[PDB]
Amino acid sequence: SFVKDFKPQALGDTNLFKPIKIGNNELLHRAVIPPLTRMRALHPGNIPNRDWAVEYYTQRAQRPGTMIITEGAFISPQAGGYDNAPGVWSEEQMVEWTKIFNAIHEKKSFVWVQLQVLGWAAFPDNLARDGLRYDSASDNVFMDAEQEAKAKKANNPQHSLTKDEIKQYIKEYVQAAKNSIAAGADGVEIHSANGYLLNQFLDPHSNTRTDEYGGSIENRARFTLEVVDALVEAIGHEKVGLRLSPYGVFNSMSGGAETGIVAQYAYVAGELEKRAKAGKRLAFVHLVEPRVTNPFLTEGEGEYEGGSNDFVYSIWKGPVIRAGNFALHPEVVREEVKDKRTLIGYGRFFISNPDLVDRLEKGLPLNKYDRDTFYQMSAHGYIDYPTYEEALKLGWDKK
Numbered sequence: 001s002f003v004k005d006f007k008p009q010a011l012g013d014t015n016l017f018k019p020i021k022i023g024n025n026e027l028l029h030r031a032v033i034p035p036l037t038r039m040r041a042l043h044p045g046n047i048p049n050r051d052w053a054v055e056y057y058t059q060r061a062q063r064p065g066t067m068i069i070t071e072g073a074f075i076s077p078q079a080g081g082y083d084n085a086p087g088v089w090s091e092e093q094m095v096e097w098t099k100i101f102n103a104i105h106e107k108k109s110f111v112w113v114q115l116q117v118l119g120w121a122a123f124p125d126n127l128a129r130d131g132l133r134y135d136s137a138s139d140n141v142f143m144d145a146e147q148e149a150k151a152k153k154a155n156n157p158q159h160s161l162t163k164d165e166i167k168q169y170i171k172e173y174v175q176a177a178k179n180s181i182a183a184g185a186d187g188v189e190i191h192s193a194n195g196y197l198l199n200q201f202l203d204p205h206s207n208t209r210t211d212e213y214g215g216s217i218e219n220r221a222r223f224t225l226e227v228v229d230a231l232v233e234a235i236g237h238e239k240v241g242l243r244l245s246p247y248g249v250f251n252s253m254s255g256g257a258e259t260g261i262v263a264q265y266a267y268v269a270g271e272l273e274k275r276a277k278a279g280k281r282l283a284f285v286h287l288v289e290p291r292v293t294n295p296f297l298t299e300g301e302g303e304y305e306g307g308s309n310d311f312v313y314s315i316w317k318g319p320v321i322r323a324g325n326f327a328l329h330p331e332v333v334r335e336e337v338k339d340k341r342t343l344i345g346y347g348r349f350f351i352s353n354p355d356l357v358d359r360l361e362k363g364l365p366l367n368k369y370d371r372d373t374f375y376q377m378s379a380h381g382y383i384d385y386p387t388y389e390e391a392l393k394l395g396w397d398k399k
C-alpha cells in the first residue's frame with residue numbers, strides 16, 4: 001500500500017531535477033540511491049545474488065542518469081563477517097558484479113561500489129569459523145556487551161590492529177577498488193561512516209590508541225585519509241568518494257555528545273579540500289544527516305537537533321550528497337537543493353519504490369516499505385515492489 005499520512009509535493013521544479021556531473025558521470029537528476037545492504041548475497045563466498053540482484057538494480061536504475069551506490073561490499077574476507085553481504089575480492093564475485101554494472105549501464109544510469117570493512121560490527125563467531133580476527137581500533141572498548149561476549153566465547157577477542165595490519169587493509173582497499181573499476185563500475189565510495197572500521201578509528205570513544213593512529217584529531221583521521229590517498233593514486237580522484245556520518249550513533253559511535261566531533265569531521269573535510277586544491281578533488285562527499293542518527297529507527301526517531309552538517313560546506317567545496325529521512329519531507333529537500341552542489345540520497349524509500357525518481361518529480365504517493373524484508377533471503381520485498389503504474393493496477397490507491 002501507499003504511505004497513508006503523507007502529502008506528496010512535486011519536486012520537478014527544483015534543482016533536484018537539474019543535471020550535474022559527479023566524477024566522470026553526467027547525472028540527469030540529483031536523487032541518489034545511497035548504499036543499502038539487503039543481505040541477499042549467497043554463502044559460501046559472499047556472492048552477489050545470482051537469481052535476483054541484476055533485477056533489483058535494473059529496477060532501481062530505470063530513470064536514466066541515476067547515480068546508484070551499491071550496498072556495502074567487503075574488500076576481503078577479513079573485512080567481512082556477514083555471510084549474506086557481498087564481497088569484491090574474488091573472481092566469482094566480480095562475475096556477478098559485472099552483470100549488475102552492465103544492467104545499470106543499459107538503463108543509462110551509473111554505479112559506484114561502496115567499499116565496506118566491518119571492524120567491531122562483524123560477527124566474531126562467523127570470523128572465528130573462517131579463521132579470521134575480530135578487528136577494531138582498540139581492544140579495551142567494545143560495540144556492546146553482547147559482541148564482547150561473542151568474541152570471548154568464540155576465542156576471538158577484539159583485536160587492536162597493528163600498523164602492519166592497517167597497511168594490509170589499505171592494500172585490500174586498493175585491490176578491491178581496482179577490481180570494481182575493472183569489472184565496470186563508475187567509481188567507488190569509501191565507507192567511513194555508520195560505526196564501521198574507519199569510523200571506529202575516527203571516533204574517540206572507539207579509538208583509545210596511543211600510536212600514530214589515535215590520541216588526536218589528526219591521528220584518528222589517519223587511516224581514513226591513507227585509504228583516500230591510496231585509492232586516488234590507484235584509480236583516480238574522479239572515481240573516489242567518501243561517506244561520513246558526523247552525528248551518527250549507530251554501532252556505538254559518539255555523535256553530538258562528543259564535543260570534539262565537529263572538529264574531527266571538519267579536519268577530514270579540510271584535508272579533502274587541501275587535496276582538491278592540489279588538483280585531486282574527490283568526486284563527492286556523502287554525509288548522513290543528523291536527521292537519522294540510527295537507520296534502524298523509524299523516520300522521525302533518533303533525530304539530533306543539536307547539530308548540523310552545514311559546517312562541511314564552509315570547508316569542502318565539491319559536491320555533497322546528503323541522506324536521511326528526505327523522502328517524507330519534500331519541503332526540506334526543496335530548501336536543501338537550492339544549494340547548487342547538493343544531491344539527496346533516498347534510502348528506505350528507494351527500497352520500496354523502484355520508480356522513486358518519477359514519483360519525486362511528479363509528487364506521486366509513495367509505496368510503504370516493509371522492514372521485515374529489508375534483510376530476508378527472499379525476492380519478496382526485494383524485487384516485487386510495484387512501480388506507480390503497477391500499484392494502480394493492483395488497486396493500491398484504494399487500499
Ligand SMILES: Cc1cc2nc3c(=O)[nH]c(=O)nc-3n(C[C@H](O)[C@H](O)[C@H](O)COP(=O)(O)O)c2cc1C
Nearest residue numbers: 034035036037071072295323324325346347348374
Ligand atoms: C536496510 C538498510 C541498509 C543499509 N545499508 C547501508 C550500507 O550498506 N552502507 C551504508 O553506508 N549505509 C547503509 N544504510 C544507511 C542508508 O544508506 C541511509 O544513510 C539511511 O537509511 C538513511 O537514509 P533514509 O532515511 O533515506 O533511509 C542502510 C540503511 C538501511 C535501512
Ligand SMILES: C=C(C)[C@@H]1CC=C(C)C(=O)C1
Nearest residue numbers: 037072082194250295375
Ligand atoms: C544491515 C546492515 C549490515 C547495515 C544496515 C545499516 C547500515 C548503516 C549499514 O552500513 C549496513
Ligand SMILES: [Mg+2]
Nearest residue numbers: 370372373381
Ligand atoms: Mg510481512
